[PDB]
Design an enzyme around this catalytic site. Structure first.
Site, PDB file in Angstrom:
ATOM      1  N   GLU A   1     -17.711   2.269  -5.884  1.00 29.29           N
ATOM      2  CA  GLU A   1     -16.215   2.226  -5.963  1.00 29.29           C
ATOM      3  C   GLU A   1     -15.753   2.970  -7.218  1.00 29.29           C
ATOM      4  O   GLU A   1     -14.740   3.658  -7.159  1.00 29.29           O
ATOM      5  CB  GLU A   1     -15.775   0.765  -5.993  1.00 29.29           C
ATOM      6  CG  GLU A   1     -15.986   0.058  -4.649  1.00 29.29           C
ATOM      7  CD  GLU A   1     -15.014   0.477  -3.562  1.00 29.29           C
ATOM      8  OE1 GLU A   1     -14.127   1.326  -3.842  1.00 29.29           O
ATOM      9  OE2 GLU A   1     -15.237   0.107  -2.386  1.00 29.29           O
TER      10      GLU A   1
ATOM     11  N   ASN B   1      -3.811   5.708  -2.798  1.00 33.51           N
ATOM     12  CA  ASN B   1      -3.985   5.712  -1.320  1.00 33.51           C
ATOM     13  C   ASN B   1      -2.802   6.431  -0.654  1.00 33.51           C
ATOM     14  O   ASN B   1      -1.720   6.563  -1.265  1.00 33.51           O
ATOM     15  CB  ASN B   1      -4.196   4.294  -0.805  1.00 33.51           C
ATOM     16  CG  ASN B   1      -5.295   3.561  -1.558  1.00 33.51           C
ATOM     17  OD1 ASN B   1      -6.400   4.058  -1.587  1.00 33.51           O
ATOM     18  ND2 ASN B   1      -5.038   2.385  -2.106  1.00 33.51           N
TER      19      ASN B   1
ATOM     20  N   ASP C   1      -0.955   5.386   1.654  1.00 30.71           N
ATOM     21  CA  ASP C   1       0.176   4.446   1.916  1.00 30.71           C
ATOM     22  C   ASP C   1       1.004   4.251   0.640  1.00 30.71           C
ATOM     23  O   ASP C   1       2.001   3.547   0.706  1.00 30.71           O
ATOM     24  CB  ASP C   1      -0.338   3.135   2.509  1.00 30.71           C
ATOM     25  CG  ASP C   1      -1.127   2.248   1.567  1.00 30.71           C
ATOM     26  OD1 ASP C   1      -1.355   2.636   0.420  1.00 30.71           O
ATOM     27  OD2 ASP C   1      -1.523   1.177   1.993  1.00 30.71           O
TER      28      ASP C   1
ATOM     29  N   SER D   1      -0.145   2.784  -2.131  1.00 33.75           N
ATOM     30  CA  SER D   1      -0.804   1.778  -2.976  1.00 33.75           C
ATOM     31  C   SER D   1      -1.839   2.500  -3.871  1.00 33.75           C
ATOM     32  O   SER D   1      -2.156   3.634  -3.686  1.00 33.75           O
ATOM     33  CB  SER D   1      -1.458   0.693  -2.147  1.00 33.75           C
ATOM     34  OG  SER D   1      -2.458   1.258  -1.343  1.00 33.75           O
TER      35      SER D   1
ATOM     36  N   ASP E   1      -5.679   1.749  -6.083  1.00 34.23           N
ATOM     37  CA  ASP E   1      -6.863   0.904  -6.330  1.00 34.23           C
ATOM     38  C   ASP E   1      -7.217   0.969  -7.818  1.00 34.23           C
ATOM     39  O   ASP E   1      -7.145   2.061  -8.376  1.00 34.23           O
ATOM     40  CB  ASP E   1      -8.039   1.408  -5.508  1.00 34.23           C
ATOM     41  CG  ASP E   1      -7.801   1.340  -4.019  1.00 34.23           C
ATOM     42  OD1 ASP E   1      -7.046   0.525  -3.563  1.00 34.23           O
ATOM     43  OD2 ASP E   1      -8.512   2.018  -3.323  1.00 34.23           O
TER      44      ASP E   1
ATOM     45  N   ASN F   1      -6.884  -3.286  -4.660  1.00 33.02           N
ATOM     46  CA  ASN F   1      -5.707  -2.557  -4.147  1.00 33.02           C
ATOM     47  C   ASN F   1      -4.398  -3.298  -4.467  1.00 33.02           C
ATOM     48  O   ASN F   1      -4.308  -4.521  -4.307  1.00 33.02           O
ATOM     49  CB  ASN F   1      -5.904  -2.326  -2.655  1.00 33.02           C
ATOM     50  CG  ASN F   1      -4.849  -1.413  -2.105  1.00 33.02           C
ATOM     51  OD1 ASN F   1      -4.873  -0.201  -2.293  1.00 33.02           O
ATOM     52  ND2 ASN F   1      -3.857  -2.006  -1.505  1.00 33.02           N
TER      53      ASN F   1
ATOM     54  N   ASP G   1     -11.730 -14.307   1.656  1.00 35.48           N
ATOM     55  CA  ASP G   1     -10.502 -14.046   2.448  1.00 35.48           C
ATOM     56  C   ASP G   1     -10.823 -13.924   3.942  1.00 35.48           C
ATOM     57  O   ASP G   1      -9.867 -13.881   4.745  1.00 35.48           O
ATOM     58  CB  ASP G   1      -9.812 -12.783   1.938  1.00 35.48           C
ATOM     59  CG  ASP G   1      -8.401 -12.602   2.447  1.00 35.48           C
ATOM     60  OD1 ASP G   1      -7.592 -13.561   2.299  1.00 35.48           O
ATOM     61  OD2 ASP G   1      -8.123 -11.503   2.996  1.00 35.48           O
TER      62      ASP G   1
END
Ligand SMILES: [Cl-]
Ligand SMILES: [Cl-]
Ligand SMILES: [Cl-]
Ligand SMILES: [Cl-]
Ligand SMILES: [Cl-]
Ligand SMILES: [Cl-]
Ligand SMILES: [Cl-]
Ligand code: NA
Length: 129
Positions: free
Chosen positions: A35, A46, A48, A50, A52, A59, A101
């Site tokens: 990562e 990203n 969209d 967003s 990270d 995110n 989650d």
């Protein structure tokens, strides 16, 4: 801060990630390598809109507040800048929420594509832990 492999393994172990929700320490070190290349200051934007953040690329769409991700949640209740600290505590505490989650470590695309089903014990080989 750019961690060494064993230095990071030791820090993650001290913070309770070894076998957290059944994921052995090497899984977490492997995910961090791919990562962020073990760099707490890593950021990536990203499509969209967003971003990270940090060693585990958490995110801003769901997990932290950066002030520029409209209609996003802040489920870890932290500014995303906290995730870039040399102190990995905030990253680790948020990662524990993420992995609880429902999709486990599959939340991390690099883990699914580069670590899952590989010999992840190799990532902690030679370390004094
Ligand atoms: Cl390495
Ligand atoms: Cl392991
Ligand atoms: Cl926001
Ligand atoms: Cl929220
Ligand atoms: Cl906040
Ligand atoms: Cl630390
Ligand atoms: Cl799981
Ligand atoms: Na957010």
């Amino acid at each position: 801060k750019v961690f060494g492999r064993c230095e990071l393994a030791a820090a993650m172990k001290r913070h309770g990630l070894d076998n957290y929700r059944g994921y052995s320490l090497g899984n977490w070190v492997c995910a961090a390598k791919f990562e962020s290349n073990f760099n707490t200051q890593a950021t990536n934007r990203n499509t969209d809109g967003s971003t990270d953040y940090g060693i585990l690329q958490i995110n801003s769409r769901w997990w932290c507040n950066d002030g520029r991700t409209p209609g996003s949640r802040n489920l870890c209740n932290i500014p995303c800048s906290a995730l870039l600290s040399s102190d990995i505590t905030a990253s680790v505490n948020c990662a524990k929420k993420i992995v609880s989650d429902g999709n486990g470590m599959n939340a991390w695309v690099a883990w699914r594509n580069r670590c899952k089903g590989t010999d992840v014990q190799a990532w902690i080989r030679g370390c004094r832990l």
